[PDB]
Write a protein that holds these residues in place. Structure first.
Motif, PDB file in Angstrom:
ATOM      1  N   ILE A  90       0.891  -1.152   0.000  1.00  0.00           N
ATOM      2  CA  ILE A  90       0.000   0.000   0.000  1.00  0.00           C
ATOM      3  C   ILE A  90       0.933   1.207   0.000  1.00  0.00           C
ATOM      4  O   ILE A  90       1.513   1.560   1.030  1.00  0.00           O
ATOM      5  CB  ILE A  90      -0.923   0.026   1.225  1.00  0.00           C
ATOM      6  N   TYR A  91       1.088   1.817  -1.169  1.00  0.00           N
ATOM      7  CA  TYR A  91       1.984   2.954  -1.342  1.00  0.00           C
ATOM      8  C   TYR A  91       1.430   4.339  -1.024  1.00  0.00           C
ATOM      9  O   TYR A  91       0.238   4.622  -1.221  1.00  0.00           O
ATOM     10  CB  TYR A  91       2.509   2.984  -2.776  1.00  0.00           C
ATOM     11  N   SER A  92       2.325   5.201  -0.555  1.00  0.00           N
ATOM     12  CA  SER A  92       2.004   6.591  -0.254  1.00  0.00           C
ATOM     13  C   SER A  92       2.274   7.346  -1.551  1.00  0.00           C
ATOM     14  O   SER A  92       2.836   6.777  -2.493  1.00  0.00           O
ATOM     15  CB  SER A  92       2.925   7.113   0.851  1.00  0.00           C
ATOM     16  N   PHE A  93       1.878   8.614  -1.614  1.00  0.00           N
ATOM     17  CA  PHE A  93       2.102   9.413  -2.817  1.00  0.00           C
ATOM     18  C   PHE A  93       3.569   9.455  -3.237  1.00  0.00           C
ATOM     19  O   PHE A  93       3.863   9.468  -4.432  1.00  0.00           O
ATOM     20  CB  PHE A  93       1.546  10.837  -2.652  1.00  0.00           C
ATOM     21  N   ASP A  94       4.485   9.459  -2.268  1.00  0.00           N
ATOM     22  CA  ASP A  94       5.911   9.492  -2.589  1.00  0.00           C
ATOM     23  C   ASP A  94       6.570   8.137  -2.869  1.00  0.00           C
ATOM     24  O   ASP A  94       7.796   8.049  -2.977  1.00  0.00           O
ATOM     25  CB  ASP A  94       6.724  10.321  -1.570  1.00  0.00           C
ATOM     26  N   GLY A  95       5.754   7.090  -2.994  1.00  0.00           N
ATOM     27  CA  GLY A  95       6.267   5.765  -3.313  1.00  0.00           C
ATOM     28  C   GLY A  95       6.700   4.804  -2.220  1.00  0.00           C
ATOM     29  O   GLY A  95       7.263   3.756  -2.535  1.00  0.00           O
ATOM     30  N   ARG A  96       6.438   5.119  -0.955  1.00  0.00           N
ATOM     31  CA  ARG A  96       6.827   4.226   0.143  1.00  0.00           C
ATOM     32  C   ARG A  96       5.709   3.268   0.536  1.00  0.00           C
ATOM     33  O   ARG A  96       4.530   3.631   0.516  1.00  0.00           O
ATOM     34  CB  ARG A  96       7.264   5.028   1.374  1.00  0.00           C
ATOM     35  N   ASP A  97       6.079   2.044   0.892  1.00  0.00           N
ATOM     36  CA  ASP A  97       5.091   1.058   1.294  1.00  0.00           C
ATOM     37  C   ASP A  97       4.768   1.174   2.769  1.00  0.00           C
ATOM     38  O   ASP A  97       5.544   0.763   3.638  1.00  0.00           O
ATOM     39  CB  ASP A  97       5.541  -0.367   0.964  1.00  0.00           C
ATOM     40  N   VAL A  98       3.582   1.703   3.029  1.00  0.00           N
ATOM     41  CA  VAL A  98       3.050   1.897   4.366  1.00  0.00           C
ATOM     42  C   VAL A  98       3.156   0.629   5.223  1.00  0.00           C
ATOM     43  O   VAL A  98       3.395   0.696   6.436  1.00  0.00           O
ATOM     44  CB  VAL A  98       1.571   2.344   4.238  1.00  0.00           C
ATOM     45  N   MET A  99       2.998  -0.521   4.577  1.00  0.00           N
ATOM     46  CA  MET A  99       3.042  -1.814   5.252  1.00  0.00           C
ATOM     47  C   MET A  99       4.400  -2.200   5.827  1.00  0.00           C
ATOM     48  O   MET A  99       4.467  -2.781   6.910  1.00  0.00           O
ATOM     49  CB  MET A  99       2.563  -2.925   4.310  1.00  0.00           C
ATOM     50  N   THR A 100       5.478  -1.857   5.131  1.00  0.00           N
ATOM     51  CA  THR A 100       6.817  -2.228   5.587  1.00  0.00           C
ATOM     52  C   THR A 100       7.706  -1.099   6.121  1.00  0.00           C
ATOM     53  O   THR A 100       8.526  -1.318   7.017  1.00  0.00           O
ATOM     54  CB  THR A 100       7.574  -2.975   4.470  1.00  0.00           C
ATOM     55  N   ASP A 101       7.524   0.107   5.591  1.00  0.00           N
ATOM     56  CA  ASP A 101       8.325   1.264   5.983  1.00  0.00           C
ATOM     57  C   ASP A 101       8.185   1.628   7.465  1.00  0.00           C
ATOM     58  O   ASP A 101       7.068   1.788   7.968  1.00  0.00           O
ATOM     59  CB  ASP A 101       7.927   2.460   5.123  1.00  0.00           C
ATOM     60  N   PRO A 102       9.320   1.759   8.183  1.00  0.00           N
ATOM     61  CA  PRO A 102       9.330   2.108   9.609  1.00  0.00           C
ATOM     62  C   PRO A 102       8.888   3.544   9.929  1.00  0.00           C
ATOM     63  O   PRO A 102       8.770   3.901  11.102  1.00  0.00           O
ATOM     64  CB  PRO A 102      10.780   1.840  10.020  1.00  0.00           C
ATOM     65  N   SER A 103       8.640   4.353   8.898  1.00  0.00           N
ATOM     66  CA  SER A 103       8.181   5.739   9.080  1.00  0.00           C
ATOM     67  C   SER A 103       6.758   5.775   9.648  1.00  0.00           C
ATOM     68  O   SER A 103       6.313   6.804  10.178  1.00  0.00           O
ATOM     69  CB  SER A 103       8.229   6.522   7.761  1.00  0.00           C
ATOM     70  N   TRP A 104       6.033   4.668   9.466  1.00  0.00           N
ATOM     71  CA  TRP A 104       4.671   4.500   9.979  1.00  0.00           C
ATOM     72  C   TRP A 104       4.790   3.433  11.068  1.00  0.00           C
ATOM     73  O   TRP A 104       4.735   2.236  10.774  1.00  0.00           O
ATOM     74  CB  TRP A 104       3.725   3.988   8.876  1.00  0.00           C
ATOM     75  N   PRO A 105       5.010   3.845  12.331  1.00  0.00           N
ATOM     76  CA  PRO A 105       5.146   2.909  13.455  1.00  0.00           C
ATOM     77  C   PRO A 105       3.887   2.088  13.757  1.00  0.00           C
ATOM     78  O   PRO A 105       3.970   0.994  14.323  1.00  0.00           O
ATOM     79  CB  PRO A 105       5.528   3.824  14.622  1.00  0.00           C
ATOM     80  N   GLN A 106       2.724   2.628  13.413  1.00  0.00           N
ATOM     81  CA  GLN A 106       1.467   1.927  13.644  1.00  0.00           C
ATOM     82  C   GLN A 106       0.802   1.627  12.303  1.00  0.00           C
ATOM     83  O   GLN A 106       0.438   2.544  11.575  1.00  0.00           O
ATOM     84  CB  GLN A 106       0.536   2.774  14.517  1.00  0.00           C
ATOM     85  N   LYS A 107       0.672   0.347  11.961  1.00  0.00           N
ATOM     86  CA  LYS A 107       0.043  -0.043  10.695  1.00  0.00           C
ATOM     87  C   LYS A 107      -1.473  -0.107  10.917  1.00  0.00           C
ATOM     88  O   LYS A 107      -2.064  -1.187  10.932  1.00  0.00           O
ATOM     89  CB  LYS A 107       0.570  -1.411  10.232  1.00  0.00           C
ATOM     90  N   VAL A 108      -2.078   1.056  11.147  1.00  0.00           N
ATOM     91  CA  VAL A 108      -3.510   1.177  11.408  1.00  0.00           C
ATOM     92  C   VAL A 108      -4.043   2.338  10.557  1.00  0.00           C
ATOM     93  O   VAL A 108      -3.357   3.347  10.385  1.00  0.00           O
ATOM     94  CB  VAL A 108      -3.765   1.450  12.919  1.00  0.00           C
ATOM     95  N   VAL A 109      -5.251   2.189  10.019  1.00  0.00           N
ATOM     96  CA  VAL A 109      -5.867   3.208   9.162  1.00  0.00           C
ATOM     97  C   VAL A 109      -7.102   3.869   9.782  1.00  0.00           C
ATOM     98  O   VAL A 109      -8.014   3.174  10.234  1.00  0.00           O
ATOM     99  CB  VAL A 109      -6.295   2.582   7.807  1.00  0.00           C
ATOM    100  N   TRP A 110      -7.130   5.201   9.806  1.00  0.00           N
ATOM    101  CA  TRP A 110      -8.282   5.932  10.341  1.00  0.00           C
ATOM    102  C   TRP A 110      -9.429   5.751   9.342  1.00  0.00           C
ATOM    103  O   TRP A 110      -9.193   5.688   8.131  1.00  0.00           O
ATOM    104  CB  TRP A 110      -8.005   7.445  10.426  1.00  0.00           C
ATOM    105  N   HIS A 111     -10.660   5.667   9.842  1.00  0.00           N
ATOM    106  CA  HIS A 111     -11.819   5.557   8.959  1.00  0.00           C
ATOM    107  C   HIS A 111     -13.122   6.132   9.547  1.00  0.00           C
ATOM    108  O   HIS A 111     -13.925   6.706   8.813  1.00  0.00           O
ATOM    109  CB  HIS A 111     -11.992   4.134   8.391  1.00  0.00           C
TER     110      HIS A 111
END
Length: 168
Positions: A90-111
């Motif tokens: 699941i990529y961000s606009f800048d091309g990083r994978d939200v699922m693996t990238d450590p920049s997102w410490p919590q793999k949770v989505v607001w809804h």
């Protein structure tokens, strides 16, 4: 050949968000000229109604790279919780994978929505305008393989926010 793209914001964000504005700005910063809206329920806005009626049944929902996540918009709100394939990035606009990238410490989505994509006024951080710890919003842990799991998270938590191409 018709598809709608689901892309994540470049940084995790707390409950005080100017969602649609962020999706638009980051989309344009990435060179995308299509209309992106936030994958969230808010004040008088059900999540299931975000995508136009004309594009809700025959357009597969893909990630930035074209990889299919859901077969169409409507199927996400059947009641199972929007079950998707966790082995797809699941990529961000800048091309990083939200699922693996450590920049997102919590793999949770607001809804802030129920399993049918309907708004939960007492579970969406006061229409996304507060980071107060005592206030909660519904978010979904991507580990469950569902995009609409019903879990409560404090609005102070910095989580993932997705943007969806609302029309073709």
């Amino acid at each position: 050949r018709p598809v709608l793209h689901l892309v994540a914001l470049n940084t995790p964000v707390a409950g005080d968000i100017r969602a649609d504005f962020q999706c638009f700005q980051q989309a344009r910063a990435a060179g995308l000229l299509s209309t992106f809206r936030a994958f969230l329920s808010s004040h008088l806005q059900d999540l299931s109604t975000v995508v136009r009626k004309a594009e809700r049944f025959g357009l597969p929902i893909v990630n930035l790279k074209g990889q299919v996540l859901f077969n169409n918009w409507d199927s996400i709100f059947s009641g199972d919780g929007g079950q998707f394939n966790t082995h797809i990035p699941i990529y961000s606009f800048d091309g990083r994978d939200v699922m693996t990238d450590p920049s997102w410490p919590q793999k949770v989505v607001w809804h802030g929505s129920n399993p049918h994509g309907v708004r939960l006024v007492d579970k969406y951080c006061e229409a996304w305008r507060t980071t107060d710890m005592a206030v909660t919003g519904f978010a979904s842990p991507l580990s469950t393989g569902k995009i609409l799991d019903q879990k409560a998270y404090s609005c102070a938590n910095r989580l993932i926010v997705l943007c969806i191409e609302n029309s073709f």
